[PDB]
Amino acid sequence: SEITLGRYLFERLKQVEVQTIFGLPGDFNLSLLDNIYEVPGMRWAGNANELNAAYAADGYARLKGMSCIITTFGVGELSALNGIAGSYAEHVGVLHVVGVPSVQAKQLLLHHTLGNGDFTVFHRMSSNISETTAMITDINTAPAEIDRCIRTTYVSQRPVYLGLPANLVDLTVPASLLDTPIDLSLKPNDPEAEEEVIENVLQLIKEAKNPVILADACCSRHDAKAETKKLIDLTQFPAFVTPMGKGSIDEKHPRFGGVYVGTLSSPAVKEAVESADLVLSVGALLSDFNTGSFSYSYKTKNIVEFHSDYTKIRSATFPGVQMKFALQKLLTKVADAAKGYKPVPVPSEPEHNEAVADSTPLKQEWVWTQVGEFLREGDVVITETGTSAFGINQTHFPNNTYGISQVLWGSIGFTTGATLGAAFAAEEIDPKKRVILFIGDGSLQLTVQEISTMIRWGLKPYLFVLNNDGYTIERLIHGETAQYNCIQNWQHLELLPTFGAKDYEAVRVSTTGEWNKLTTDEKFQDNTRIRLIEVMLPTMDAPSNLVKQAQLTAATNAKN
Amino acid sequence: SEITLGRYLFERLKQVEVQTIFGLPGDFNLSLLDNIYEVPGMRWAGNANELNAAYAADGYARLKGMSCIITTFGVGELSALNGIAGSYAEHVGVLHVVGVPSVSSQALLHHTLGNGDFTVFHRMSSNISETTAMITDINTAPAEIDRCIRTTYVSQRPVYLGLPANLVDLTVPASLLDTPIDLSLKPNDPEAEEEVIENVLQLIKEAKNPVILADACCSRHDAKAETKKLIDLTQFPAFVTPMGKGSIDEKHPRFGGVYVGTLSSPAVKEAVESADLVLSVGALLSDFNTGSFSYSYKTKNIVEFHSDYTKIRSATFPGVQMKFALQKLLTKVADAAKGYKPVPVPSEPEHNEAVADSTPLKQEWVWTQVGEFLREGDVVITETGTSAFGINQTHFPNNTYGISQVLWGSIGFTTGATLGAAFAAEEIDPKKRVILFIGDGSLQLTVQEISTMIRWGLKPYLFVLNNDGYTIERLIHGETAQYNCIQNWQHLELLPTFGAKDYEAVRVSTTGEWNKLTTDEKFQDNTRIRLIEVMLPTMDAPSNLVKQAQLTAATNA
Numbered sequence A: 001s002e003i004t005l006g007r008y009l010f011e012r013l014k015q016v017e018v019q020t021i022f023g024l025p026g027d028f029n030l031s032l033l034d035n036i037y038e039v040p041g042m043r044w045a046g047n048a049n050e051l052n053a054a055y056a057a058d059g060y061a062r063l064k065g066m067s068c069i070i071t072t073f074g075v076g077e078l079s080a081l082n083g084i085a086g087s088y089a090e091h092v093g094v095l096h097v098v099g100v101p102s103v104q105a106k107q108l109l110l111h112h113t114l115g116n117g118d119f120t121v122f123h124r125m126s127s128n129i130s131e132t133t134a135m136i137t138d139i140n141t142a143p144a145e146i147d148r149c150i151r152t153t154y155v156s157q158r159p160v161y162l163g164l165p166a167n168l169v170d171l172t173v174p175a176s177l178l179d180t181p182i183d184l185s186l187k188p189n190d191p192e193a194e195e196e197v198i199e200n201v202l203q204l205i206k207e208a209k210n211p212v213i214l215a216d217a218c219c220s221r222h223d224a225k226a227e228t229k230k231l232i233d234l235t236q237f238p239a240f241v242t243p244m245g246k247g248s249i250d251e252k253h254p255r256f257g258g259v260y261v262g263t264l265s266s267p268a269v270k271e272a273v274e275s276a277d278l279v280l281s282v283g284a285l286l287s288d289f290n291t292g293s294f295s296y297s298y299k300t301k302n303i304v305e306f307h308s309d310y311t312k313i314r315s316a317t318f319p320g321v322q323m324k325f326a327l328q329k330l331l332t333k334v335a336d337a338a339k340g341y342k343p344v345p346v347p348s349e350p351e352h353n354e355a356v357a358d359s360t361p362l363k364q365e366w367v368w369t370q371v372g373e374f375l376r377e378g379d380v381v382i383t384e385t386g387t388s389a390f391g392i393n394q395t396h397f398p399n400n401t402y403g404i405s406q407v408l409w410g411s412i413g414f415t416t417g418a419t420l421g422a423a424f425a426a427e428e429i430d431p432k433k434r435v436i437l438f439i440g441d442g443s444l445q446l447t448v449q450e451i452s453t454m455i456r457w458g459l460k461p462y463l464f465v466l467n468n469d470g471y472t473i474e475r476l477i478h479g480e481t482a483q484y485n486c487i488q489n490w491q492h493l494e495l496l497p498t499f500g501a502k503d504y505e506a507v508r509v510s511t512t513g514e515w516n517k518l519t520t521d522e523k524f525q526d527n528t529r530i531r532l533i534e535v536m537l538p539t540m541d542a543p544s545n546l547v548k549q550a551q552l553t554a555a556t557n558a559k560n
Numbered sequence B: 001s002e003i004t005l006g007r008y009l010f011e012r013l014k015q016v017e018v019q020t021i022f023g024l025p026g027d028f029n030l031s032l033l034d035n036i037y038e039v040p041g042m043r044w045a046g047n048a049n050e051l052n053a054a055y056a057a058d059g060y061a062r063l064k065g066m067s068c069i070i071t072t073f074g075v076g077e078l079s080a081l082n083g084i085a086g087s088y089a090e091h092v093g094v095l096h097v098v099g100v101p102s103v104s105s106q107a108l109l110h111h112t113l114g115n116g117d118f119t120v121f122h123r124m125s126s127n128i129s130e131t132t133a134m135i136t137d138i139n140t141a142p143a144e145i146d147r148c149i150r151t152t153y154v155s156q157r158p159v160y161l162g163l164p165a166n167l168v169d170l171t172v173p174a175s176l177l178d179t180p181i182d183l184s185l186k187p188n189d190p191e192a193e194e195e196v197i198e199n200v201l202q203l204i205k206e207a208k209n210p211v212i213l214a215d216a217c218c219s220r221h222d223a224k225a226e227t228k229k230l231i232d233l234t235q236f237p238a239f240v241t242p243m244g245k246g247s248i249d250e251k252h253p254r255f256g257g258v259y260v261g262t263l264s265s266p267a268v269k270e271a272v273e274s275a276d277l278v279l280s281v282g283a284l285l286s287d288f289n290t291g292s293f294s295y296s297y298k299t300k301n302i303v304e305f306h307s308d309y310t311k312i313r314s315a316t317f318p319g320v321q322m323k324f325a326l327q328k329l330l331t332k333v334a335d336a337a338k339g340y341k342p343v344p345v346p347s348e349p350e351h352n353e354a355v356a357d358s359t360p361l362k363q364e365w366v367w368t369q370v371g372e373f374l375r376e377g378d379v380v381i382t383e384t385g386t387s388a389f390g391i392n393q394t395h396f397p398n399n400t401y402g403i404s405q406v407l408w409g410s411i412g413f414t415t416g417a418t419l420g421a422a423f424a425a426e427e428i429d430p431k432k433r434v435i436l437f438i439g440d441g442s443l444q445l446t447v448q449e450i451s452t453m454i455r456w457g458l459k460p461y462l463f464v465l466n467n468d469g470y471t472i473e474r475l476i477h478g479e480t481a482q483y484n485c486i487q488n489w490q491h492l493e494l495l496p497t498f499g500a501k502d503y504e505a506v507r508v509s510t511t512g513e514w515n516k517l518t519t520d521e522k523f524q525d526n527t528r529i530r531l532i533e534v535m536l537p538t539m540d541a542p543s544n545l546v547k548q549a550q551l552t553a554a555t556n557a
């Protein structure tokens, strides 16, 4: 009893909960894609381009655990690379399958049209932004090679490149291979290295007078949210998230003290974290840097970083000591270690805006607080590079909120595709889960067509478009009135019906009363159709600590 | 007297006729961009994404001879890579300038892979560049900039120039701008050239059925007049590849149409495949396979004039340059071809038989009818899909500039190329029309670049072929597969949705409707941007594609 290697791919992807496939068809993947329609519960998104496809795969992988995008040799694969790179940078498990010319390599050479002298060139380009690669050449090893690529994607949480020649996808393999699951479990830690790490961490905890816990980008990605909650529970140490970590600590926890954004933190959060004599960083990735926007660092060097891959203690690096296992062992002994601790109180924010007149023009500082009233448990909140990403750091999340904000890679446009991916993933998880996008008017332009694919599948995101007449975040750094910071004015309300939407809402809000009227309405709160909310904001308006920091950078002689 | 390195770049660009700069701003290019406004006459396109900006730079370079796209470190530059690779594949001179971190911050996490390797993106682009520079020394920088510009224009392939943010604000003597960049070619080694010429002349002497074939680099490397003289003096049949269409002015009695290898017409296929010598001008590749056709010749007796070298049968003559070598050949070639006896060459109908105005539009009808609309000086842009194949049957007036990316074949390219070509055209002559045929499927990939056309008040004709999906793909495999289907868009609403105030958007479904629009005197003048949505059956295509589809249906039975 045999199945094609093509069918085998998708049956595997199904076993690991990948149901939606991203990409575009082309010369070398059409017979491959035919298998999707024969695998119960698999679908093909039908993306509007390959870059967006990759962004969407990234968004889907963030919620579901991994994802698969399929492109074609040359034109499709090169179009996806920025998506793939951002997934690599932010540790998101994206399987990138590339249909290539059939396997004296006459067919590859006739089809290979770059006119360089090398048909491996695209593979070699992808290698730079891939955990591993594979180019399948042999039917007899192909099943194992695909299993390895899927396992690696999942376990390492980084992109994997899989080249599938057209002629191999049609060859058959025994169906019975599917009856043995892909091993998705992490390799155990080294008992001796782990034990050393744990002993040192316990000793540092015993010795600290003002320890804090800092959840970062990989806390949730590597399945350590529970472990982290437990760490806060057993220690009672003040707990904070970085902007990439937001949602990884349920924010109603009594010990949750807010988001640490460096010099952009509230004064109290800044003092709370920067006064710490020990930092336990869980899922660390965002570890210390500089940007023309914000200066993230000024703490102690007494840090313990549980990275997914290794652990760092002050200066020492214990390679191969993995976060989740290392945390679990630490939990068996951490209550004792922290037994000597008197609970320093945590920073708090005002929970609501002050009441103002309904006529009041919308401003960002007000908006970001007010979003807190609309959010609910189970929401997915996506924020684009630009003022949105900075603004969301002040917003109060309910319990069980999944944040997506691409703080490290910072590719504007990402979020329209990420919204698509997340919405597919969220519908598979719970049809009641809402996906809420905040995207700038500038960023929207780069990837706007992926709205079309949301309509195509009857997906129901809230698309809050922030209309401030261009690239405000860039205006604040340089060229406040430069033509390169301006954009063509689009009719945002007309986007949905221009892409064929029949069942949608498109509304513009310019005031506090308008915002409230829309967002407190019970019908709007139900995820019943796709909606675009156009939010009219002043061009130089931005979250306050950002504005203050912009005035700082501009005053100082410190530079690049 | 001193100017910034940034200002120097843009002044050097102005001297080589680059007036519009493509790209998107970002973290390490903002101070660079400031310089644009300091240089009289230069402008920043303001593109809607970096992929489209690369597609636009490519269209711009095709018309003006070279272009410049500027992107930001990591996120900008990697978005543009498919645009660059296409310009590499088809020999288009695109300068990709990337604003990078200063050479003393590196010495950031935002937009890097997390490894501290700040060279990974430059190394990625080196694979699809003629050459690269990463500038680190203010003292050598003007020379490195000139080198990159020269190699871009001379080699007609992309060049990658990395510019650290600290370097752009540093100063260089303005006096350097007073000596031009040298863009000239050295003459050929006379020995090698004499050898190529005598060998080609013998081949002509001995050939019974020789043909001329002009490909893309005939135009790119400025061999059009030499190629015309070749046809005049020899009276040999003369064809173009799809990539080279427009390279031979089609009103020449010896022009026999377009050779598309296995997808050529019966008559063209036979005229080329029975040749006992092919004189190829500007071949990109004389051998390649597409998802749609096979391209090759029957004879081993192939002469290839390339920009960089010459090939005769299996022998290569490195450094024997097309233009100089063709000029030398023409002095002797009438004598070599003295015996040749002409004959009619193949042709396609110039006109359609009159039919009823209610006649629904079909592809075969439309591609011939386009010939009635075109005029001398037009730029005619066709997307990968049915359009690229149908245009091959359209008669081009003299001096028609075709853009059709048949070799790289990346759908979506033409939306950007149309922007780039429309800027370049406006710089050449505001009255030169830019005419695009793009499928509904390809439009989706790069649609937002319509916004940038509107922004600059550019006035292209955008013919959108609505056949409800990916028809070329349907004909190959998966006729009714969901992956060949697309979300249906309201094309007539694209222009106003992207902020167009002065535009037309019209839908044509019949022969009569087509004719009322295109014969309208006012329509024929490029007074405003236009979208024309052309309604076509789902499985309709030019008859070569239809024939191929029935061929593999009656077969595989």
Ligand SMILES: Cc1ncc(C[n+]2csc(CCOP(=O)(O)OP(=O)(O)O)c2C)c(N)n1
Binding pocket: A384, A385, A386, A387, A388, A410, A411, A412, A413, A439, A440, A441, A442, A443, A444, A466, A468, A470, A471, A472, A473, A474, B024, B025, B026, B027, B050, B072, B075, B076, B079
């Ligand atoms: C692909 C890509 N191109 C360019 C940039 C540089 N960039 C960062 S923010 C930004 C402007 C964002 O504008 P908008 O979405 O309108 O945000 P806001 O006005 O709310 O700041 C740009 C161009 C980038 N990060 N990624």
Ligand SMILES: Cc1ncc(C[n+]2csc(CCOP(=O)(O)OP(=O)(O)O)c2C)c(N)n1
Binding pocket: A024, A025, A026, A027, A072, A075, A076, A079, B383, B384, B385, B386, B387, B409, B410, B411, B412, B438, B439, B440, B441, B442, B443, B465, B467, B469, B470, B471, B472, B473
């Ligand atoms: C960037 C890219 N992605 C995918 C492909 C594969 N491809 C070739 S033609 C085609 C369909 C084009 O459809 P459309 O523009 O509507 O043209 P039609 O054939 O219907 O006239 C596709 C998906 C490609 N060539 N380039």
Ligand SMILES: [Mg+2]
Binding pocket: A386, A440, A441, A442, A466, A467, A468, A469, A470, A471, A472, A473
């Ligand atoms: Mg904006």
Ligand SMILES: [Mg+2]
Binding pocket: B385, B439, B440, B441, B465, B466, B467, B468, B469, B470, B471
């Ligand atoms: Mg189509």
